[PDB]
Design a protein around this ligand. Structure first.
Ligand SMILES: Nc1ncnc2c1ncn2[C@@H]1O[C@@H]2COP(=O)(O)O[C@H]3[C@@H](O)[C@H](n4cnc5c(N)ncnc54)O[C@@H]3COP(=O)(O)O[C@H]2[C@H]1O
Lengths: 85, 85
Protein backbone atom coordinates (compact mmCIF):
# COMPACT_ATOMS: atom_id res chain seq x y z
CA UNK A 1 0.00 0.00 0.00
CA UNK A 2 3.08 2.20 0.21
CA UNK A 3 5.05 0.36 -2.45
CA UNK A 4 1.86 0.33 -4.48
CA UNK A 5 1.76 4.13 -4.44
CA UNK A 6 5.42 4.54 -5.31
CA UNK A 7 5.08 2.22 -8.32
CA UNK A 8 2.18 4.35 -9.51
CA UNK A 9 4.26 7.54 -9.15
CA UNK A 10 7.13 5.87 -10.97
CA UNK A 11 4.72 4.70 -13.63
CA UNK A 12 3.09 8.11 -14.01
CA UNK A 13 6.54 9.55 -14.56
CA UNK A 14 7.62 7.21 -17.35
CA UNK A 15 4.35 6.96 -19.27
CA UNK A 16 1.97 9.84 -19.74
CA UNK A 17 -1.43 10.04 -18.02
CA UNK A 18 -3.81 12.44 -19.76
CA UNK A 19 -7.19 14.12 -19.26
CA UNK A 20 -9.48 14.00 -22.28
CA UNK A 21 -12.97 15.50 -22.67
CA UNK A 22 -15.81 13.43 -24.18
CA UNK A 23 -17.19 14.64 -27.51
CA UNK A 24 -20.76 14.44 -28.85
CA UNK A 25 -19.71 11.62 -31.16
CA UNK A 26 -18.78 9.60 -28.07
CA UNK A 27 -21.66 10.52 -25.73
CA UNK A 28 -24.42 7.92 -25.52
CA UNK A 29 -21.81 5.23 -26.10
CA UNK A 30 -19.87 3.12 -23.58
CA UNK A 31 -16.14 2.42 -23.50
CA UNK A 32 -16.93 -1.15 -24.57
CA UNK A 33 -18.90 0.29 -27.51
CA UNK A 34 -15.86 2.31 -28.59
CA UNK A 35 -13.76 -0.78 -27.76
CA UNK A 36 -10.88 1.46 -26.76
CA UNK A 37 -7.97 -0.78 -25.70
CA UNK A 38 -8.56 -3.21 -28.57
CA UNK A 39 -8.64 -0.26 -30.97
CA UNK A 40 -6.01 2.09 -29.55
CA UNK A 41 -4.01 0.23 -26.89
CA UNK A 42 -5.15 2.80 -24.32
CA UNK A 43 -6.25 2.11 -20.74
CA UNK A 44 -9.00 4.20 -19.16
CA UNK A 45 -8.21 4.69 -15.49
CA UNK A 46 -11.11 6.87 -14.38
CA UNK A 47 -13.87 9.29 -15.34
CA UNK A 48 -14.59 12.74 -13.92
CA UNK A 49 -18.31 13.39 -14.28
CA UNK A 50 -19.19 16.88 -13.09
CA UNK A 51 -17.72 16.89 -9.59
CA UNK A 52 -17.80 13.12 -9.16
CA UNK A 53 -14.82 10.80 -9.54
CA UNK A 54 -15.61 7.46 -11.12
CA UNK A 55 -12.65 5.17 -10.46
CA UNK A 56 -12.30 1.99 -12.56
CA UNK A 57 -15.34 2.87 -14.71
CA UNK A 58 -17.79 0.12 -15.58
CA UNK A 59 -17.15 -0.40 -19.29
CA UNK A 60 -20.87 -0.85 -19.99
CA UNK A 61 -22.19 2.48 -18.65
CA UNK A 62 -23.13 5.32 -21.00
CA UNK A 63 -20.63 8.16 -21.47
CA UNK A 64 -22.14 11.64 -21.14
CA UNK A 65 -21.03 14.87 -22.83
CA UNK A 66 -18.30 16.65 -20.89
CA UNK A 67 -17.07 13.52 -19.15
CA UNK A 68 -13.32 13.83 -18.65
CA UNK A 69 -11.55 10.52 -19.33
CA UNK A 70 -8.25 9.88 -17.55
CA UNK A 71 -6.03 7.81 -19.88
CA UNK A 72 -2.68 6.02 -19.95
CA UNK A 73 -0.75 4.90 -23.00
CA UNK A 74 1.89 5.89 -25.50
CA UNK A 75 1.64 9.43 -26.86
CA UNK A 76 1.32 7.99 -30.36
CA UNK A 77 -1.81 6.10 -29.25
CA UNK A 78 -3.34 8.90 -27.13
CA UNK A 79 -2.96 11.34 -29.99
CA UNK A 80 -4.73 9.05 -32.41
CA UNK A 81 -7.63 8.61 -29.99
CA UNK A 82 -7.85 12.37 -29.39
CA UNK A 83 -8.01 12.98 -33.15
CA UNK A 84 -10.54 10.23 -33.84
CA UNK A 85 -13.12 12.07 -31.73
CA UNK B 1 -4.07 15.20 -13.23
CA UNK B 2 -2.42 11.88 -12.76
CA UNK B 3 -2.47 12.81 -9.09
CA UNK B 4 -6.11 13.54 -9.20
CA UNK B 5 -6.29 9.81 -9.50
CA UNK B 6 -3.87 9.37 -6.63
CA UNK B 7 -5.56 12.09 -4.57
CA UNK B 8 -8.93 10.37 -4.82
CA UNK B 9 -7.51 7.03 -3.66
CA UNK B 10 -5.91 8.57 -0.56
CA UNK B 11 -9.13 10.19 0.68
CA UNK B 12 -11.37 7.30 -0.42
CA UNK B 13 -11.80 4.68 2.28
CA UNK B 14 -13.38 1.98 0.09
CA UNK B 15 -11.18 2.21 -3.03
CA UNK B 16 -7.46 1.53 -3.25
CA UNK B 17 -4.53 0.58 -5.49
CA UNK B 18 -3.11 -2.81 -4.67
CA UNK B 19 -0.22 -4.82 -6.05
CA UNK B 20 -0.56 -8.57 -6.52
CA UNK B 21 2.32 -10.87 -7.42
CA UNK B 22 1.57 -13.63 -9.91
CA UNK B 23 1.52 -17.16 -8.51
CA UNK B 24 2.08 -20.40 -10.45
CA UNK B 25 -1.68 -20.86 -10.18
CA UNK B 26 -2.07 -17.53 -11.96
CA UNK B 27 1.08 -17.81 -14.09
CA UNK B 28 0.49 -19.39 -17.48
CA UNK B 29 -2.89 -17.68 -17.60
CA UNK B 30 -3.83 -14.42 -19.32
CA UNK B 31 -5.92 -11.61 -17.88
CA UNK B 32 -8.51 -12.40 -20.57
CA UNK B 33 -8.55 -16.02 -19.42
CA UNK B 34 -9.32 -14.72 -15.93
CA UNK B 35 -11.55 -12.05 -17.54
CA UNK B 36 -10.73 -9.80 -14.62
CA UNK B 37 -12.66 -6.59 -15.29
CA UNK B 38 -15.74 -8.38 -16.58
CA UNK B 39 -15.78 -10.67 -13.53
CA UNK B 40 -14.70 -8.43 -10.65
CA UNK B 41 -14.86 -4.84 -11.87
CA UNK B 42 -11.12 -4.48 -11.28
CA UNK B 43 -8.90 -2.44 -13.57
CA UNK B 44 -5.31 -3.48 -14.21
CA UNK B 45 -3.38 -0.27 -14.97
CA UNK B 46 -0.02 -1.94 -15.56
CA UNK B 47 2.14 -5.02 -14.95
CA UNK B 48 5.56 -4.86 -13.30
CA UNK B 49 7.98 -7.03 -15.21
CA UNK B 50 11.27 -7.05 -13.35
CA UNK B 51 11.58 -3.36 -12.53
CA UNK B 52 9.84 -2.24 -15.71
CA UNK B 53 6.18 -1.26 -16.25
CA UNK B 54 3.95 -2.80 -18.93
CA UNK B 55 1.16 -0.24 -19.35
CA UNK B 56 -2.31 -1.11 -20.65
CA UNK B 57 -1.24 -4.78 -20.76
CA UNK B 58 -2.22 -6.93 -23.72
CA UNK B 59 -4.93 -9.16 -22.22
CA UNK B 60 -3.86 -12.14 -24.36
CA UNK B 61 -0.30 -12.60 -23.10
CA UNK B 62 0.35 -15.26 -20.48
CA UNK B 63 1.23 -13.95 -17.04
CA UNK B 64 4.74 -14.98 -16.06
CA UNK B 65 6.05 -15.76 -12.59
CA UNK B 66 6.91 -12.66 -10.59
CA UNK B 67 4.64 -10.38 -12.60
CA UNK B 68 3.17 -7.73 -10.35
CA UNK B 69 -0.36 -6.71 -11.35
CA UNK B 70 -1.12 -3.14 -10.38
CA UNK B 71 -4.84 -3.08 -9.70
CA UNK B 72 -7.37 -0.40 -8.94
CA UNK B 73 -10.97 -0.93 -7.82
CA UNK B 74 -13.40 -1.27 -4.92
CA UNK B 75 -11.97 -2.98 -1.82
CA UNK B 76 -14.62 -5.69 -1.85
CA UNK B 77 -13.87 -6.45 -5.50
CA UNK B 78 -10.13 -6.48 -4.96
CA UNK B 79 -10.52 -8.65 -1.87
CA UNK B 80 -12.72 -11.14 -3.72
CA UNK B 81 -10.27 -11.55 -6.59
CA UNK B 82 -7.38 -12.04 -4.17
CA UNK B 83 -9.18 -14.75 -2.22
CA UNK B 84 -9.92 -16.75 -5.36
CA UNK B 85 -6.15 -17.07 -5.82
N1 LIG C 1 -6.29 -4.01 -17.92
C1 LIG C 1 -7.34 -4.95 -17.68
N2 LIG C 1 -7.80 -5.05 -16.46
C2 LIG C 1 -8.77 -5.90 -16.16
N3 LIG C 1 -9.33 -6.70 -17.08
C3 LIG C 1 -8.90 -6.66 -18.37
C4 LIG C 1 -7.83 -5.73 -18.74
N4 LIG C 1 -7.57 -5.90 -20.21
C5 LIG C 1 -8.51 -6.87 -20.45
N5 LIG C 1 -9.12 -7.17 -19.43
C6 LIG C 1 -10.12 -8.16 -19.50
O1 LIG C 1 -10.13 -8.78 -20.85
C7 LIG C 1 -11.46 -8.48 -21.44
C8 LIG C 1 -11.31 -8.05 -22.85
O2 LIG C 1 -10.31 -7.05 -22.89
P1 LIG C 1 -10.09 -6.15 -24.20
O3 LIG C 1 -9.04 -5.16 -23.86
O4 LIG C 1 -9.59 -7.00 -25.32
O5 LIG C 1 -11.34 -5.30 -24.75
C9 LIG C 1 -11.96 -4.39 -23.80
C10 LIG C 1 -11.52 -3.03 -24.08
O6 LIG C 1 -11.28 -2.86 -25.50
C11 LIG C 1 -12.64 -2.17 -23.64
N6 LIG C 1 -12.41 -1.72 -22.34
C12 LIG C 1 -13.08 -2.19 -21.46
N7 LIG C 1 -12.73 -1.63 -20.27
C13 LIG C 1 -11.64 -0.71 -20.74
C14 LIG C 1 -10.75 0.22 -20.22
N8 LIG C 1 -10.77 0.46 -18.85
N9 LIG C 1 -9.88 0.90 -20.99
C15 LIG C 1 -9.84 0.70 -22.28
N10 LIG C 1 -10.65 -0.16 -22.87
C16 LIG C 1 -11.55 -0.88 -22.17
O7 LIG C 1 -13.86 -3.00 -23.64
C17 LIG C 1 -13.41 -4.38 -23.99
C18 LIG C 1 -14.02 -5.41 -23.12
O8 LIG C 1 -13.90 -5.01 -21.75
P2 LIG C 1 -14.27 -6.06 -20.59
O9 LIG C 1 -14.05 -5.42 -19.28
O10 LIG C 1 -15.73 -6.38 -20.70
O11 LIG C 1 -13.46 -7.44 -20.56
C19 LIG C 1 -12.01 -7.38 -20.63
C20 LIG C 1 -11.45 -7.56 -19.30
O12 LIG C 1 -12.30 -8.48 -18.56
Amino acid sequence: ASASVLDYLELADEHSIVELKATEKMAGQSIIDLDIRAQYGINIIAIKRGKEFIISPNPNINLEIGDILIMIGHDNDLNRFEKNI
